[PDB]
Amino acid sequence: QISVRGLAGVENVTELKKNFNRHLHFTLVKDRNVATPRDYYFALAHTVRDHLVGRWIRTQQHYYEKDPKRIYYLSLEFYMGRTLQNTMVNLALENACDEATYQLGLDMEELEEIEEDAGLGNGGLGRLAACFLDSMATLGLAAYGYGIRYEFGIFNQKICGGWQMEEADDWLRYGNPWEKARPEFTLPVHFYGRVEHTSQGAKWVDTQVVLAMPYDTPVPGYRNNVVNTMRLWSAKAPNDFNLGYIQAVLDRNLAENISRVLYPNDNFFEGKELRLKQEYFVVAATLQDIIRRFKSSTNFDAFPDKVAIQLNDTHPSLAIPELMRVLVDLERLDWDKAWEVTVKTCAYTNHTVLPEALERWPVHLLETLLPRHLQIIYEINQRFLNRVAAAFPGDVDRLRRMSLVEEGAVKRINMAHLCIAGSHAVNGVARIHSEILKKTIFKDFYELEPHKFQNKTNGITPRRWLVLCNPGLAEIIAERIGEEYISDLDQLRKLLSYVDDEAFIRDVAKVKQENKLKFAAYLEREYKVHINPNSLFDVQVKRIHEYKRQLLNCLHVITLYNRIKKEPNKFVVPRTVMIGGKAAPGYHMAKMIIKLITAIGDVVNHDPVVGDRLRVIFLENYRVSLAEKVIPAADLSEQISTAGTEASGTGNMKFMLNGALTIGTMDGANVEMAEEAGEENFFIFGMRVEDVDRLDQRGYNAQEYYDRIPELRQIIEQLSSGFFSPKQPDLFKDIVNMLMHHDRFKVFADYEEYVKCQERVSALYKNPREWTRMVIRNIATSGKFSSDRTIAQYAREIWGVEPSRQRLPA
Amino acid sequence: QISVRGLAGVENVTELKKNFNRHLHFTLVKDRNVATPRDYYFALAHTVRDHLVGRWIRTQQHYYEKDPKRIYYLSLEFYMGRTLQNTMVNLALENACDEATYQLGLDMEELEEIEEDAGLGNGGLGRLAACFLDSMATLGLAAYGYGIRYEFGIFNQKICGGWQMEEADDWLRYGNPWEKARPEFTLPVHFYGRVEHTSQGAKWVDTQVVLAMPYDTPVPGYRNNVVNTMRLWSAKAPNDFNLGYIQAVLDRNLAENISRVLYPNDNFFEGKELRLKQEYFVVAATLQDIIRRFKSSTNFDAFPDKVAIQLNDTHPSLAIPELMRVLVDLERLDWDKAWEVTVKTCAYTNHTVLPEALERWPVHLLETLLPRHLQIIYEINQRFLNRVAAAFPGDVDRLRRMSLVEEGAVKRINMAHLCIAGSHAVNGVARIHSEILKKTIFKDFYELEPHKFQNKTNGITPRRWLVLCNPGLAEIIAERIGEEYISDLDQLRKLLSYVDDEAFIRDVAKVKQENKLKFAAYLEREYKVHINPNSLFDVQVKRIHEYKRQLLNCLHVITLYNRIKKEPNKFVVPRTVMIGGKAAPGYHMAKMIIKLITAIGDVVNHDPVVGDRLRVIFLENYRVSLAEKVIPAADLSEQISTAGTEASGTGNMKFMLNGALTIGTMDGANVEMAEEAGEENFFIFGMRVEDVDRLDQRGYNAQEYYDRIPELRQIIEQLSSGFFSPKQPDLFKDIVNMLMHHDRFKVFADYEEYVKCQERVSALYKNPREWTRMVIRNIATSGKFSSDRTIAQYAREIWGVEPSRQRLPA
Numbered sequence A, B: 001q002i003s004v005r006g007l008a009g010v011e012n013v014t015e016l017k018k019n020f021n022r023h024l025h026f027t028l029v030k031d032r033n034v035a036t037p038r039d040y041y042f043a044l045a046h047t048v049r050d051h052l053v054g055r056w057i058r059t060q061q062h063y064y065e066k067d068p069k070r071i072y073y074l075s076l077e078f079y080m081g082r083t084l085q086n087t088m089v090n091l092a093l094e095n096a097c098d099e100a101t102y103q104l105g106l107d108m109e110e111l112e113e114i115e116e117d118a119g120l121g122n123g124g125l126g127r128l129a130a131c132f133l134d135s136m137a138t139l140g141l142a143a144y145g146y147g148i149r150y151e152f153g154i155f156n157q158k159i160c161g162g163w164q165m166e167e168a169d170d171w172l173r174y175g176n177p178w179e180k181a182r183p184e185f186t187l188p189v190h191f192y193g194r195v196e197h198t199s200q201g202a203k204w205v206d207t208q209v210v211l212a213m214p215y216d217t218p219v220p221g222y223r224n225n226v227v228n229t230m231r232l233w234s235a236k237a238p239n240d241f242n243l244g245y246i247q248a249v250l251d252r253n254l255a256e257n258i259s260r261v262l263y264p265n266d267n268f269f270e271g272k273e274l275r276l277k278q279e280y281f282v283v284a285a286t287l288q289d290i291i292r293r294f295k296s297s298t299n300f301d302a303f304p305d306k307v308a309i310q311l312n313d314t315h316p317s318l319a320i321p322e323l324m325r326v327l328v329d330l331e332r333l334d335w336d337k338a339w340e341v342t343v344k345t346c347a348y349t350n351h352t353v354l355p356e357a358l359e360r361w362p363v364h365l366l367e368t369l370l371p372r373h374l375q376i377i378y379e380i381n382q383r384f385l386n387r388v389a390a391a392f393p394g395d396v397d398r399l400r401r402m403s404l405v406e407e408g409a410v411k412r413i414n415m416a417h418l419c420i421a422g423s424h425a426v427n428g429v430a431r432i433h434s435e436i437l438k439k440t441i442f443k444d445f446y447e448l449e450p451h452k453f454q455n456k457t458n459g460i461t462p463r464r465w466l467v468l469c470n471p472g473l474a475e476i477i478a479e480r481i482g483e484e485y486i487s488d489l490d491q492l493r494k495l496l497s498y499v500d501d502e503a504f505i506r507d508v509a510k511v512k513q514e515n516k517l518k519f520a521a522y523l524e525r526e527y528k529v530h531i532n533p534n535s536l537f538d539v540q541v542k543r544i545h546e547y548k549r550q551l552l553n554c555l556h557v558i559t560l561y562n563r564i565k566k567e568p569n570k571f572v573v574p575r576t577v578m579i580g581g582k583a584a585p586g587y588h589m590a591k592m593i594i595k596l597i598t599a600i601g602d603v604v605n606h607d608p609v610v611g612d613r614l615r616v617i618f619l620e621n622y623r624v625s626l627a628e629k630v631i632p633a634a635d636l637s638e639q640i641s642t643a644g645t646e647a648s649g650t651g652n653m654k655f656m657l658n659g660a661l662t663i664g665t666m667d668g669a670n671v672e673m674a675e676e677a678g679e680e681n682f683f684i685f686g687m688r689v690e691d692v693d694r695l696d697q698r699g700y701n702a703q704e705y706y707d708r709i710p711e712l713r714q715i716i717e718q719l720s721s722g723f724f725s726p727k728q729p730d731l732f733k734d735i736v737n738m739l740m741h742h743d744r745f746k747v748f749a750d751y752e753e754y755v756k757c758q759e760r761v762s763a764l765y766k767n768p769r770e771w772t773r774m775v776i777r778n779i780a781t782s783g784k785f786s787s788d789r790t791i792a793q794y795a796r797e798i799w800g801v802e803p804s805r806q807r808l809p810a
């Protein structure tokens, strides 16, 4: 059908067909008379997977021979989503598989919908790791993603009576055809115990052992025959574990619980023992694998020339004292030499400045669980602070501020401080965020070691986030500028030459309308919800958080509703307002925000006077596969966090690439997006970081805004009085009370400017041709936000390796 | 190499080779440069498994079309052992696979040793189920084995300091290539709750749900292209289970523990809740599957014409009240009609008369866990006892004896009574055992319903237990009488014509010597133990139990030792005495017996005066794969249980078929073995059942034997005084005290006759030609003990179906 999907050659189609039938028979043990769509999905998955095998084996063989510097990306989260389509795209098999299945009487799109998301992350941080793996493979880097194979990923969200309910995501129930268990490379991980000091160094003894069993998933690069590995560890008890008899066998679950479930908090630290066990488990198993591979190339001076470890936030920070432990206690290196190796090997990426998100582990927990690591952390701290004292003599308050050990009611270790001390590079994830790091929370560290601090603005992979989810747009683009942009997204700038081309304008607008029709249809089928496909699709999808200000969106929606009720017969641009995202199960205010949104929908969607001029829809169970459907359908992207709070954002970039205009604050990467597209082509509003600081200095008083803005007062009165909850009039009191007396995110302060900016959005939507022209200017300047650009920068500026677009032989 | 192993055709060998290489690449994702023997085993297993698929699909298709009566064999235990060789044997692929692997530079025997036993049973009862499945497939019956897929089977036994230690049998660690998960046929099972009575019958409500997920294993018949199914259920929690958040997900293990571990007691009832859950779980899931398959053929009058359910002991006895529950509560049949259907569908096999082995469940447990089933059991009991009262008016003690409900400190349900009331047939497992049932524990039931009681003497499959484990013997037999005997074992009678044939005598003796050399070699390799291969191999392998009297064997061994010490320079026939078996982890006396055996070895094996005239070896970790090695090597089979205690025995039959002579009591199937071979060709000794009864009537006084037999007194003094435990002189006091004051199994009473009989064994071993002639007479008359004979009898006399030796088309 479409060119970017590759060729459907007769020989290939014929071979895919027979391999599909072979798997259906020999692998699934079914005949076509009792096979279900799920069986057909599996037969296709095994057929496609077979094409990865040769490339996977030859890629790993190649790294063994060439011995390049290896990149180890450590993360507690990898939000991969579905794998089938991505694999076809990267191997150029999509059209051929479409043809083969069609000849077999099957609709491939239908089979794709059967696959479960691999949801081993919470949101942005996890999904960034996934885009990064795709880019590292596409750029030919010898890169390995290491994490935990959670049995249960991020929970499935059900909405019941307008409230979030959670159910376990049993993603492995039907099997996972994309992983290969490797029980032969199982490794031991130690916990608890005690330290004993001998004539010959420290020894960690009397430990409990848990086994780490690896499962390997292939990561194909884009049409370059490179297939890298993501290795995820699963916890297993040893067979003599606890070894009356029956109870000892049942108690094996204590050990195996380490890999059972993903902690479901986004941007929030919960200091539980099980989480600490997960963090050490991934680090300890991974480092043994790293050292093994390094020895199979005795002198660790070359270690940093052959190994880079990138810490995705502080969650794998124990890699620093673990590497020291191994080098000092096991390999017998002197401390100073070991520390030199460690610093040159490790680099740290920070993804947040919110205080409640920073990891500060109680000393008593580390003391019990990881006694030798605590000793090492203390020694690191003493040596570090000796350097600080030498650099800033007499500055005693600096010593307390910079210490890895925090004093107080309960002593804690600040893991960010540990990572900075033990890494040769520290980066933020968007220019404004990296600046904020140097000016505020890490200022002291920047003054001691300015050379460590860098920026690496985030990106997204244009394979998944354009070619895969929006083939219509990819095609009309390729028609004008060829296919090269898929691995060189900066080529999209060539599209500026078409901003006055009538045919292109029409095609861009047509693709959006088709995407909107398709999404409107999906809504009716799977959720029996009707929507007007000619309305402006106004979408805010991301995790539910106070800092992301879904509440500000709600205030605008109610404003719109109230204005319609006031002048029913006045024309207003019709909108469908869609808000989706998951709340952490323990985050009460986030759960209340979900209920407010559905409550607003209950009123608005059933008021005859509104008609279909305004609809408010809560999109249930937002996840990667849903993002792939809704983002291509969106007209307006809401990126409205309080300035200074969203470190980068990446949903923002997905919307830009897919033909939505953005309404947003000057926060995170929004700043760079506006810079690339031009401020005239972006709907910017609200306080800047400097304005937020000014307000904090004089004191934020929400009452002032309530007193001066009658439309806002009306909304608050509606909320308090029970207008949106007739049977439970005080249902939203916690929300009102937060907004009026302890709003850390200054929702009222940006309300007036937000509403006025939304009016400018509506005015532009009334002129389709100029709306589309502005869309073309955004798509055309989205190239900087490819994760290929991001990864090339990490490679050259942190890891010391050169990317390559050269193909291995098939 | 050898004929019974089939043909090695060029086309087949070529195809096996390329499929082996294909699996190594695509399935295992390895190249030959990093592959290990384990990878090679897996590649071979997948290659062989592919040959099962077509036959498996076509067999099950065939049953769907023809709609024959289906046989459901319900068991909590299936002791399958290894699958690779058995599969090759039954598909005629052994020689071809041997040739293919040899051409690839691999030794197939080596690869076979990598496979784990599937050890989902304790011993005889579990292994009987496995032989039965093989026979049902070989006889073309539409038969299904249903059980539980335990994550951990029977524990691995390690001996440390002469004591048994247990370690978990993590048999699934590397995967199981022989099963197919079928998550699509998952079914709900209910627990707890309460009963509510409506206008329209009872309703079981407020239950907790556990899901039963099936895994299917193929069961190939011998060269007939039939492949039946063994379906084993695994426990899974529902996704809303327990649904703070993290704890709710971790608590899923409560539900999943149902299928975690096999209870490791042989012939001993332990009344624990988890065991009851396992029993209901298998029954409830299985019955839904049965009914489903029956409806997909509304009138249940035909149910017994289309379904037979065989209960392997009382462990699945809840099938009776569950079937009633489904028919009465769900399908709305009247009670009397439902009971008629149930009785005609169910049949019960009893495997023990030991009181401590009989299941008697506390009423309070059933009341809490299965409230509706308890109501039904009460109703069954009332109606049954009404029949008894009508038949035996005024006999009130009979009413209390026959009741399903036992009165006392704690009320219990007698599950054997339930099974008899609810089955149209009840059988024992050897003629003497079936007689014992009618004369003692089930006498009252036999008087009420004589027609229900039958015998079905046990058997073993001659595929695994001759062709597979003793190819040398199978071949020298086939040379004389052709290959037909492998599925018609009665043809072995033809061998009586060769009892005076000098060439045959020599060949039989040669095969035994080769087996003994091979086993002696295995001992040195894997256990660094040296043995004299010219000695008489005297073996007792079976679970460790007081009733099996390993202790009597020990007394003979010590007698032999003491006699040598007394007259060192007198010639005695050299023996290697091997004893193996597992003790239940909580069975203290059994663990003490293991320690006594190793203790005797420590003394005997290191006494220079004994030399290699006597060796005592404890065979560690006895299991099906070890049985396949040691049984072909044995000269003397010890089958020495107290008369009346071993219901049948099946190890006895394995030894007979493999060229060992038997020393044994007239117990279980030993009686029928002696009858078939002739008493002159069997070493029979000891009390008969009638003698044991006589002694019990006058009172067993062990002191009498001690007082009259000086050789016995000497042994007891040695045990008490610390001769076999220098550092812990009173280590064996529990044993001595049991033997002298509370021996339920009358070890001393059979001692004199046992020792004298062992002397006759030694005298015959001195004459190789006559030893071998007697061996030929045993092998030649072992035909009755094929499980094909047994299954043909169940089919004709209980299930109402005809066996068939006709081949399906390949």
Ligand SMILES: OC[C@H]1O[C@@H](c2nc(-c3ccc4ccccc4c3)n[nH]2)[C@H](O)[C@@H](O)[C@@H]1O
Pocket (backbone or CB within 6 Å): A049, A050, A052, A053, A177, A178, A179, A180, A181, A182, A217, A218, B026, B027, B028, B029, B175
């Ligand atoms: O090896 C992990 C899984 O191995 C499956 C298995 N997987 C593969 C396999 C084979 C090829 C593959 C190629 C790409 C990605 C994944 C791949 C996986 N071979 N065997 C078993 O079916 C499953 O129970 C087990 O957990």
Ligand SMILES: OC[C@H]1O[C@@H](c2nc(-c3ccc4ccccc4c3)n[nH]2)[C@H](O)[C@@H](O)[C@@H]1O
Pocket (backbone or CB within 6 Å): A122, A124, A125, A128, A265, A266, A267, A268, A269, A270, A351, A352, A357, A358, A429, A458, A646, A647, A648, A649, A650, A668
């Ligand atoms: O850099 C990728 C993304 O990382 C998100 C992010 N996620 C987390 C996060 C994610 C999971 C966490 C779990 C425990 C403790 C803290 C945690 C913090 N921190 N930062 C940022 O909010 C977003 O702007 C960003 O684009």
Ligand SMILES: OC[C@H]1O[C@@H](c2nc(-c3ccc4ccccc4c3)n[nH]2)[C@H](O)[C@@H](O)[C@@H]1O
Pocket (backbone or CB within 6 Å): A026, A027, A028, A029, A175, B049, B050, B052, B053, B177, B178, B179, B180, B181, B182, B217, B218
């Ligand atoms: O389906 C059960 C197992 O399915 C394996 C699988 N097994 C088969 C299969 C395929 C053919 C078979 C033929 C005979 C016996 C067993 C057979 C099993 N196909 N897929 C997966 O690799 C494993 O993770 C999963 O538990």
Ligand SMILES: OC[C@H]1O[C@@H](c2nc(-c3ccc4ccccc4c3)n[nH]2)[C@H](O)[C@@H](O)[C@@H]1O
Pocket (backbone or CB within 6 Å): B122, B124, B125, B128, B265, B266, B267, B268, B269, B270, B351, B352, B357, B358, B429, B458, B646, B647, B648, B649, B650, B668
């Ligand atoms: O019939 C097969 C075999 O069954 C054995 C047998 N095994 C059990 C057994 C096995 C497991 C049990 C678990 C719980 C409670 C009772 C249990 C009883 N009962 N009988 C007999 O001892 C043997 O002579 C016999 O040949």
Ligand SMILES: *Cc1c(COP(=O)(O)O)cnc(C)c1O
Pocket (backbone or CB within 6 Å): A122, A123, A124, A127, A541, A542, A543, A622, A623, A624, A627, A648, A649, A650, A651, A652, A654
């Ligand atoms: C991209 C993405 C995110 C990140 O969105 P932000 O708006 O940057 O927070 C979260 N969840 C999913 C499923 C995504 O695909």
Ligand SMILES: *Cc1c(COP(=O)(O)O)cnc(C)c1O
Pocket (backbone or CB within 6 Å): B122, B123, B124, B127, B541, B542, B543, B622, B623, B624, B627, B648, B649, B650, B651, B652, B654
């Ligand atoms: C046959 C067999 C048994 C049964 O032996 P008995 O001597 O009849 O108790 C027990 N265990 C294993 C492994 C077997 O193969």
